[PDB]
Point group: D2
Chain length 226, copies 4
């Protein structure tokens, strides 16, 4: 199998754990707490802001013109905002998205994930290292959305069902581009480099698990100790 | 006087030197050599595309989402934008613009200029250091364009008069956008920081002087020796 | 005046004080408590040494990245001296733990490893080294290393629970004095470099220090419980 | 022919231009002006901290301990060592070295040179790109020194003959160290990468030409009229 397929396949057991965790389970059932939704939406916004800086930092690493335009198109898509899935969650908890995201939320797991993406963006000249760190985001969401649409436990009577419907189709184009880039950018990489890039992808899949759960448990930096 | 206006005012004596140099003087008269025009257009196209990276590098330094939109707009222009002034010079030498710019040209003076921008983008946290290295260009060209329109040496029978006409009006908004960006970014800078930022601006005005003159003298890295 | 001190404290003192409750938690956690007693498992020792060797390698790189941020040539000389010292090889504290488990140090530590907690700590130090111009941001991210170790070492030397019959007592003894110069230098640098920082910058520098103190707690606990990246299913 | 030897051979025509320029020719004759000597020594002293930064920036890029030790030893030498050739020039103009270097000098040609080194240190993960930007210096001085010792135009009665004598042998070990480092670090580089690394070396050889000439002509950033 190809490099990106190997990464995707290696990540699937972690995605199964995400799907079976409390955040996604409660969201599937249309019973996720207001607090978990709020903390997720607030954090998600902080993470997404950095995912955009990361795209910008990849521009100088690209030699191909098509790859640069892809990155710029992504930044523009991220700057437009108004993602239908966020509106679904905002509606679900009866708070406008504008009012919810006025309170910023890098809890510890977010800080780790974001600093993982930045480490690669600063330290590695080959964009594959950073792409591998960001790619689990759309892949995880796609797998979850598609699975939910065929899960007999999907609560179709809740507006939360539209969150899964959104991710079941809207990530595929981006997943395909990231796979093509990882496959192409790693052709001349050594086995030690490919191992590190693979690890970046698996770690980011774990970071995704921790990101949903961070919202679920209201994870905070506990500076007062015990 | 605001910081951005202080910088622009300080750059004026250098802009006067640029105006009186052979590139602009010969262009005013519609007498600039085809070689000088061709090399200038090649270098301009080569660096415009490279500036994409500098703008991209400043996106993470901006706290304002409107400043990020500005940077993304400039990237789009570097990638797929057209400048009517290019067509004017292409017509002047009777060659298609897209044929002229097939050959990339990276002279020693251009290397210095782009590495000045990169140093600031890499090394300095405050985007002002890099914005000050990029901002002189539109002001240099605006000053030249406006001055040329009232100059007795302007050859109005040559299509080159349209190059000056273009620059006399089409840079003013960008000069203002850069002024507001510099004033806001430097609101809380120290005097030492301001001095360094001002120096970046004056140096880049000199880099613009050399950008014209490197085309004028066909400046090359002399790797092969015998001077 | 009001710029230099907050509630009667310099900036470095404020940070140190804010971190102390976390250090108390570290001292009373299983890793340090077992080590105090000379009862820390051989497995925990090996896990600690492997991760710590990887951490110290990166700590050295962080010092190198601070050099261009320093305006003073005396500060550059201090950093170069620290790097030179790091390159001489094996911290004596590591040899003490190897002796405690009756194994040669070179057979214990063979490969690079950044377990989850170490990975976070290292990437936090690097973020600051790459992203922040003022060296204070990076110094704040690294300073809990010598500070935590100094506080623990000094506390242990006075603690009646210290097992003085075990060679592990020498680990605490080493840290009770060998970090003092570095703690002093880092405190001086933090105080000097933050003189003209905004309240927002100071808050972020302070959070870097407290985060790194939490990272120190997690680093010891990572070794204690054999924390590792779990890439398989059913976790 | 090794990669590093290819670079050095390619640089020779530039070094021939340097040797025939005013700075070296006047120095050969024992008549280089006091002002040129001071400006040269001041520039050399002024960039020492910047060169130190460049070496420090390469430490994290090295996989080998022995390469890290080399970089640290270079920094140590620069910070704590003394270059006898500086004392020879100070003696030549009858001014103490410590007095000459009280004033800093950062000319336009020096700004170009240092920004070329920094560009590479920041942008290129492989240290070879920056090493190639640094390595010409000792080779330029070695070639000049050895040529001077066989040149009948050398003023052997002037203390300046000792400057050429110093450089005729004191750079050779560093030239060799840089050779071996470039050969090792570029062993798996693409032809595109090698072309860029070679260009960095040739550009730095020209920067060394301008480092001497900027002292010779008292080059300045002229921010005012004319």
């Amino acid at each position: 199998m190809t490099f990106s397929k190997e990464l995707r396949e290696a990540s699937r057991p972690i995605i199964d754990d995400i799907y079976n965790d409390g955040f996604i389970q409660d969201l599937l059932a249309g019973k996720l707490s207001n607090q978990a939704v709020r903390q997720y939406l607030r954090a998600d916004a902080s993470y997404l802001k950095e995912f955009t800086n990361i795209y910008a930092m990849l521009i100088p690493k690209m030699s191909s013109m098509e790859d640069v335009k892809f990155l710029v198109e992504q930044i523009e898509f991220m700057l437009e905002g108004e993602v239908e899935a966020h509106e679904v969650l905002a509606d679900f908890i009866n708070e406008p998205y504008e009012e919810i995201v006025k309170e910023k939320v890098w809890p510890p797991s977010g800080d780790h994930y974001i600093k993982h993406m930045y480490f690669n963006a600063f330290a590695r000249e080959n964009a594959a290292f950073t792409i591998a760190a960001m790619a689990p985001c759309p892949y995880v969401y796609a797998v979850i959305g598609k699975r939910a649409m065929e899960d007999p436990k999907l609560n179709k009577e809740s507006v939360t069902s539209k969150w899964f419907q959104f991710y079941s189709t809207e990530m595929d184009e981006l997943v395909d581009v990231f796979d093509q880039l990882m496959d192409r950018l790693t052709k001349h990489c050594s086995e030690t480099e490919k191992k590190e890039i693979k690890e970046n992808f698996l770690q980011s899949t774990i970071h995704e698990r921790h990101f949903f759960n961070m919202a679920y448990i209201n994870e905070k930096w506990e500076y007062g100790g015990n």
